[PDB]
Amino acid sequence: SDSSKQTEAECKGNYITYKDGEVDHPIIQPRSWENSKFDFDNVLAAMMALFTVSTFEG
Amino acid sequence: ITEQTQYFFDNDSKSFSGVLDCGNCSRIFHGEKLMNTNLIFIMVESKGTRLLIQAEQTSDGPNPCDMVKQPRYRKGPDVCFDNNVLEDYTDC
Amino acid sequence: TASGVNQLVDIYEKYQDLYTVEPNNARQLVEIAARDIEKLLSNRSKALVRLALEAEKVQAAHQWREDFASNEVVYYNAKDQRIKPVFIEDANFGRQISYQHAAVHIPTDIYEGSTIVLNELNWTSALDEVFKKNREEDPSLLWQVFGSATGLARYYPASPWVKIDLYDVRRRPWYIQGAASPKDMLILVDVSGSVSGLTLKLIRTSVSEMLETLSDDDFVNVASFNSNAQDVSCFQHLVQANVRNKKVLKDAVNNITAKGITDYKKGFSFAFEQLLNYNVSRANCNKIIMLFTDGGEERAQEIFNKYNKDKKVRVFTFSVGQHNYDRGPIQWMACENKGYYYEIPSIGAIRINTQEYLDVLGRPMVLAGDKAKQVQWTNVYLDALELGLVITGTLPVFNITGQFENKTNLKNQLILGVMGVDVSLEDIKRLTPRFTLCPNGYYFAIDPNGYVLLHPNLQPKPIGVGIPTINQEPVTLDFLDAELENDIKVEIRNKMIDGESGEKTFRTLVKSQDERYIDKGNRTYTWTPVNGTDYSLALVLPTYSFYYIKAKLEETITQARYSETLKPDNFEESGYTFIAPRDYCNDLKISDNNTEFLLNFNEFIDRKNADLINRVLLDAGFTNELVQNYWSKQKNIKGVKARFVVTDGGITRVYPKEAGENWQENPETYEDSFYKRSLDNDNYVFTAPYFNKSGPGAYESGIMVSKAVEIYIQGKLLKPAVVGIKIDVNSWIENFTKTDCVILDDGGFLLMANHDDYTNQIGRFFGEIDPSLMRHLVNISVYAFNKSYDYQSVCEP
């Protein structure tokens, strides 16, 4: 979720996100090591994602 | 940074007189200090401009672009550990 | 006749006994206070040294475990395997304390149980024993903190952390003071066309969050290059990064805009020229340049070979923003020089990156083994645990892994962090007992930079800068900006900084305690340095404050009638009686319920610092004698609305027992404006009440008068007490009428004007009533003025 933690191990606990980019007014949010909506983990998942690409949406 | 002000007696003289020239007009005053007391007695004429406000009001401090020209005296520390030969520059 | 000054003088004189007018030596007193403060700071330094050695030793043997699922580390997280604590509501800190386990404060954005935080917690778990040892070998030690360089903060008295927790130990003033030596920064903000947009916002925010990390003894400036190296500010050289100059630099940075063509050679040439401006009083060490840029393609080899030939400068470089330009030249620039390269993808990474250059800057001092283990005190600053004003001690703890094995090929050149202790200015304010002095005297100390410390006008709130705006910084008042500035006092300030010890006397101006009057007076200064540290304690005695009336008493019967003299039940026949809040051996302070404090005092005296109580009871007895002898007898004179007397100690007595219901003056006589002024001047002083106050006054209170009761006990001028009358306004208006006649005082306050409209608005500063008359009156060599500045004040806009 944070862009400055490039691994699962170092992506945990809360962090700070700023509303509309204003330097002031922080917002505390959790970190989640989530995959993309559509992933190429498996051949089935790859076929699924590449089918979404074939529809020109997402 | 407010800006306070105070007023106080300057001269030891007790009697003061003169004319006021607000505009196209004259006024009469005679100032007398009640001796042995922190008081001044004056007699201005009947009424007939820009207000003095002794009460502190908000403002900005001294123009820092000016005081930097002649900064106040300052004696900083004299250790400043730096410039060591046995240092590993292999971080980057 | 009403107050009876001579009556009080005779009362004092007839009892030649009960006195011992010891002289404030004004030099021995300063020396002993200096020695006591030095001893306190030495205690703190010793605690710091032992803690630092223990931390180094424990870190040396850690073995760097990596499997903490078993043998879990036990600690107490502050923002609450965690511990279940029990809190003792001790009054020393004003919050919850435990004294049996050291809290921890992991900043919000750090993960609780990473493989680095967990190791820090384990290996610091040994620090708890030494924390306890320190706090046990001497109480009254507030905080021991350990700001390890991983975000942690292991402070021993475990209290719940004081809403988004943005605290980050590596940014606090007391950490930077320890982690690195002073600096001479020069931020080369890259305002070229290639940064317009979000990246410019990141650059401005990053520059601001960096200037937030500069102390008051290390200089800075902000250049910017777009084929021409202008300066975003009005300075054109290094400017000490005060709390104020930082404001100008931040505003300049905020009001910047991209344009033009990038040209590193010109920008760096200008920058290196600015660092060779030796005749502007620079701080001669850590010559640093910190380029902010998106990306470049022209490594300015020629300029780095012309200047900086001997690697004198330390070039840091940030490739701020999310872009795709070459980052080769920037990395090479950071590498060739003894620098280091960072990256700021977007907000959130600013806070943890801009503070990292301290790790690099700490390399030389780490490589200097123990020449840097020197306790280095910071400047005053409001606590982070709502405790008050505290100055911190710092003592960096180094990384010794392989020491005495002599591998010397590791990351052994970085500090573990800074471990510091806090000293409450309320704890230096009791090593300088002000009570023996007259209400005009006081102590004060200054940093070598001149910033005050333990000064009466140092109010606990952040120093303001600039006008506010429509919608943590240290409290640094320059000694000249805390008092009236004239030619002579600047000499004294300069002579304190050098450490020269001497004495001076002169006639100067002193601002009244209520900021509405100024008075000429004599102030025999005094200044010595505290050899332990970089401070120069001072002491300002007027000419009449040399001797003080000490009280000795043994009968147990005279003090008896003095003790039941001021009982609240005797007000009707002895007049009202305040008592100032003064710290008896164990009595609880006032909760601004002066009646309840008086009752507590009654109980304590009934049961049984002794001089303070002795002398306050002595004053109570003398004031009772005066009031009963004269004020009681000649009750209710024609023009006397209220008879009041104030002494040292706090015995304020107002005869009617009803005016006391309308006695707005503070019980602590040392803070009562009229008292200090009345002491300073040599005649009756009139203090017009304020106008448009919420409470009553000026018709049901009557204007005030005062006249210090000068004494010749044995040939020495003493001014213990002040007496006055709240003259009823109406009767004295009649007296005035029986003689536009305006009665006026210094400060331009209308005590009267024959015109009936004016006297209704009595007490206003004349000047908003008939301006031109004053404007001309100032012009004829009467009613001069001084326009000083207050750096601690509240504004609505």
Ligand SMILES: *[C@@H]1O[C@H](CO)[C@@H](O)[C@H](O)[C@H]1NC(C)=O
């Ligand atoms: C330190 O504090 C203790 C307890 O108040 C005191 O006795 C001692 O004189 C002080 N000085 C030292 C040892 O630094």
Ligand SMILES: *[C@@H]1O[C@H](CO)[C@@H](O)[C@H](O)[C@H]1NC(C)=O
């Ligand atoms: C670290 O934890 C282990 C296992 O509990 C313990 O034996 C060791 O002494 C600890 N060291 C530190 C740094 O506290």
Ligand SMILES: *[C@@H]1O[C@H](CO)[C@@H](O)[C@H](O)[C@H]1NC(C)=O
């Ligand atoms: C910004 O700086 C420019 C310099 O040309 C000046 O003209 C302008 O008044 C400044 N504006 C602000 C917002 O300070």
Ligand SMILES: *[C@@H]1O[C@H](CO)[C@@H](O)[C@H](O)[C@H]1NC(C)=O
């Ligand atoms: C100290 O440095 C050693 C290597 O020199 C390293 O293993 C250890 O992690 C460091 N200690 C701390 C406090 O991280």
Ligand SMILES: *[C@@H]1O[C@H](CO)[C@@H](O)[C@H](O)[C@H]1NC(C)=O
């Ligand atoms: C105060 O005003 C007096 C009289 O004009 C002047 O002599 C003096 O320098 C002023 N002092 C300050 C601190 O402004």
